[PDB]
Amino acid sequence: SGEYPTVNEIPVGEVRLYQIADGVWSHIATQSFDGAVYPSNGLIVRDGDELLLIDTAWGAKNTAALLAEIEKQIGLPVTRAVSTHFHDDRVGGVDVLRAAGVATYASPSTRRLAEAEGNEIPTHSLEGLSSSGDAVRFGPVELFYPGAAHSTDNLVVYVPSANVLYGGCAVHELSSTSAGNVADADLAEWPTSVERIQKHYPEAEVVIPGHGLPGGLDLLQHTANVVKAHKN
Ligand SMILES: CC(C)c1cccc2c(O[C@@H](C)c3ccccc3)c(C(=O)O)[nH]c12
Numbered sequence: 181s182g183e184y185p186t187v188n189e190i191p192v193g194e195v196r197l198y199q200i201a202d203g204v205w206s207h208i209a210t211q212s213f214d215g216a217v218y219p220s221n222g223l224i225v226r227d228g229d230e231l232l233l234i235d236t237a238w239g240a241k242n243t244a245a246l247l248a249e250i251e252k253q254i255g256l257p258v259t260r261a262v263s264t265h266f267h268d269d270r271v272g273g274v275d276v277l278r279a280a281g282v283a284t285y286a287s288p289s290t291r292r293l294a295e296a297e298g299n300e301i302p303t304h305s306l307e308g309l310s311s312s313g314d315a316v317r318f319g320p321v322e323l324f325y326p327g328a329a330h331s332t333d334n335l336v337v338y339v340p341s342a343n344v345l346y347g348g349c350a351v352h353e354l355s356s357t358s359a360g361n362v363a364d365a366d367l368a369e370w371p372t373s374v375e376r377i378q379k380h381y382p383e384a385e386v387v388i389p390g391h392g393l394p395g396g397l398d399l400l401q402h403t404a405n406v407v408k409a410h411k412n
């Protein structure tokens with residue numbers, strides 16, 4: 181009924197949308213992994229009479245439910261998707277998207293890592309993002325590679341029309357007391373990567389983490405803080 185939806189409020193297999201700004205939504209779904217249930221976010225950005233999707237809903241059936249929820253609530257077609265790193269909460273569901281006719285994209289790094297992991301693989305490579313600090317336009321968003329953080333390949337997404345910064349899994353929510361799933365992280369580089377984000381997007385008004393509640397720019401420093409406390 182209005183607040184941002186949390187893990188215990190979303191059965192696995194259901195998807196919620198949350199309006200962030202004019203023409204910008206997050207999507208929220210839950211999934212079981214190693215015997216625990218976690219929420220995760222993605223983004224939807226209106227692209228004229230089409231939609232750009234950022235990240236899957238963490239699984240095939242969740243991603244099918246995402247497409248159905250989009251049709252119910254927005255009623256515009258998803259024509260392109262970008263996955264912001266290679267983990268299943270970002271690419272799991274790409275095959276569903278691809279068969280629905282959505283053109284799926286990720287950096288070459290992400291595609292390689294997804295393939296090596298046995299995860300689903302976006303179709304098209306996003307060039308121009310291989311060096312930290314790189315930025316490219318993609319429809320109504322800018323894609324930015326901040327450097328290694330939560331993963332070596334993680335991308336962030338900015339929506340200039342709305343000053344929305346989607347940090348993906350490189351950015352943690354304010355309530356987080358840990359650094360999440362760090363199996364593929366670079367904890368030593370992560371704070372430098374966050375600094376690059378902070379410097380590049382000083383006008384961001386909303387910051388959306390890969391998991392949990394959006395907030396403001398404080399999420400960026402908080403992320404550096406929780407990573408530093410994990411590394412220590
Ligand atoms: C490798 C993927 C599929 C995965 C599986 C299971 C859990 C995670 C996870 O912990 C997230 C949910 C998290 C962030 C902060 C505090 C606690 C937890 C993350 C993340 O931090 O991005 N990724 C997860």
Ligand SMILES: [Zn+2]
Pocket residue numbers: 265267269330331349
């Ligand atoms: Zn991840």
Ligand SMILES: [Zn+2]
Pocket residue numbers: 220267269349390391
């Ligand atoms: Zn994640």
